[PDB]
């Protein structure tokens, strides 16, 4: 509740199940969708798994 705004900027088509699961958990389903998630250790772990695919901004 500090938060992170995550945008899916690259196509995950054909990516490993782990990485597709991390996208699932971040709720990113289509290209250029943006989500504001709570900045937790867990949410950070999932953004880390899909770093190539996403753009991250610190928000509150």
UniProtKB/Swiss-Prot annotation:
The keyword Ribonucleoprotein applies. PROSITE patterns: RIBOSOMAL_L30. GO terms for biological process: translation. The keyword NADP does not apply. GO terms for cellular component: cytosolic large ribosomal subunit. Pfam families: Ribosomal_L30. GO terms for molecular function: structural constituent of ribosome. Keywords: Ribonucleoprotein, Ribosomal protein. Belongs to the universal ribosomal protein uL30 family. Part of the 50S ribosomal subunit. This is Large ribosomal subunit protein uL30. The gene is rpmD.
């Amino acid at each position: 509740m500090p938060r992170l705004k995550v945008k899916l900027v690259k196509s995950p088509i054909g990516y490993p199940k782990d990485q597709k699961a991390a996208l699932k958990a971040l709720g990113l389903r289509r290209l250029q969708q943006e989500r504001v998630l709570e900045d937790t250790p867990a949410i950070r772990g999932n953004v880390e798994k899909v770093a190539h695919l996403v753009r991250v901004e610190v928000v509150e």
